[PDB]
Design a protein around this ligand. Structure first.
Ligand SMILES: [Zn+2]
Ligand SMILES: [Zn+2]
Ligand SMILES: [Zn+2]
Ligand SMILES: [Zn+2]
Ligand SMILES: [Zn+2]
Ligand SMILES: [Zn+2]
Ligand SMILES: [Zn+2]
Length: 294
């Protein structure tokens, strides 16, 4: 039989990791029922054996960013960005993805800094800007989005420009934007996720700014991809361990398609030790019942 790279997850604690849906630290773990909303984020999606899904890409600093060049909308402070690919090359809308990698995956107004990156002429050319992901002008899959800013002159036409997100005004974590605008349809989405094993609920990796919940920390996406360790079954059994005592706090299923479930009924904001981390223990069959959480 073939001997393949052993699967592992990072040894980073929750607070040492970052949300995969916005460039901010994770703050804590949360579990609760999810039958009343559709959980289909497009960022923070990756299989355990290293296949990226939806709009998921590797770099934490490219999460919810946009890149390209802008054209002034005459008589307004607003600008249309004509998107580039992720390396700054020609955007190619025929790729089978929902949108440019790193595109935001929730409806809301994201504020940030829009900056010209080349041939500044000695000017900073960075300005506060906002992009509304629910707006009719939000058409990243078509290759353009619209920003509101406080200038009408400062951005030179035909010069590379980048948006770095800073925060969200106020928004709907679970509602995907219309990547191609009104009366369109989203295409090539990573699938919705749900707990199908009775007594199980999804485990969310949660930050603030409202809650923002992801299915995998960004560092897990990066680790899974970099390692590309093959899966031995549909479910990897992880233990959350506290090295300060050496004891297991709880166990959970890391599903091969890239999400986590725990045995619990109801909302529970987990209380974890500062140094606790996840440890891969074994691959299990489809009949493994987890030890109860809390
Ligand atoms: Zn102009
Ligand atoms: Zn791309
Ligand atoms: Zn210039
Ligand atoms: Zn300004
Ligand atoms: Zn790693
Ligand atoms: Zn390695
Ligand atoms: Zn599974």
């Amino acid at each position: 039989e073939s001997r393949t790279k052993p699967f592992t997850v990072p040894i980073l604690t929750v607070e040492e990791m970052t949300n995969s849906r916005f460039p901010i630290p994770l703050e804590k773990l949360f579990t609760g029922p999810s039958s009343a909303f559709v959980v289909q984020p497009q960022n923070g999606r990756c299989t355990t054996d290293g296949a990226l899904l939806g709009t998921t890409q590797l770099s934490p600093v490219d999460i919810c960013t946009f890149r390209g060049d802008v054209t002034h909308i005459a008589g307004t402070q607003n600008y249309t960005m004509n998107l580039a690919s992720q390396n700054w090359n020609n955007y190619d809308p025929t790729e089978e993805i929902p949108a440019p990698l790193g595109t935001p995956d929730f409806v809301g107004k994201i504020q940030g800094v829009l900056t010209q990156t080349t041939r500044r002429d000695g000017s900073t050319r960075g300005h506060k800007a906002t992009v509304s992901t629910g707006s009719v002008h939000f058409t990243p899959k078509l290759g353009s989005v619209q920003f509101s800013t406080d200038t009408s002159n400062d951005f030179e036409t035909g010069q590379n420009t980048r948006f770095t997100p800073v925060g969200v005004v106020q928004p709907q974590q679970w509602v995907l934007p219309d990547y191609s605008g009104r009366d369109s349809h989203n295409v090539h989405l990573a699938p919705a996720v749900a707990p199908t094993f009775p007594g199980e609920q999804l485990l969310f990796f949660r930050s603030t700014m409202m809650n923002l919940d992801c299915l995998l920390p960004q560092e897990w996406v990066q680790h899974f991809y970099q390692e590309s360790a093959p899966a031995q079954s549909d479910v990897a059994l992880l233990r959350f361990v506290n090295p300060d005592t050496g004891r297991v706090l709880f166990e959970c299923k890391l599903h091969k398609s890239g999400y986590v479930t725990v045995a619990h009924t109801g909302q529970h904001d987990l209380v974890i030790p500062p140094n606790g981390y996840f440890r891969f223990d074994s691959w299990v069959n489809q009949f493994y019942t987890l030890a109860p959480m809390g």
